[PDB]
């Protein structure tokens, strides 16, 4: 299993490399477009990055449901 301390830095790292802002400002309850104010491109970027880095199974379906930080962090954290 993977410690939440790892996923936290991991997920945040990507979100930072994709957007380019401070991982801190990125709220967990907030979304990628809701608060972040990003576009569909951002969300999709995080999705692929997850199934690429975390090697998780995030298909179109799971990709449509996972469009928020809390949602993403929840999925990965749940799929240890």
* Catalytic residue set: 39
The Cα–Cα gap between 13 and 61 comes to 24
The Cα–Cα gap between 31 and 17 comes to 16
CA dihedral (2, 50, 61, 27) positive or negative: positive
Q: What is the 8-class DSSP label of residue 25?
A: T
């Amino acid at each position: 299993g993977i410690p939440l301390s790892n996923i936290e830095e991991r997920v945040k790292k990507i979100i930072v490399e994709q957007l380019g802002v401070d991982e801190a400002e990125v709220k967990n309850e907030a979304s990628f477009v809701d608060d972040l104010g990003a576009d569909s491109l951002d969300t999709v970027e995080l999705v692929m990055a997850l199934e690429e880095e975390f090697d998780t199974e995030i298909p179109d379906e799971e990709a449509e449901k996972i469009t928020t930080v809390q949602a993403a962090i929840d999925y990965v954290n749940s799929h240890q």
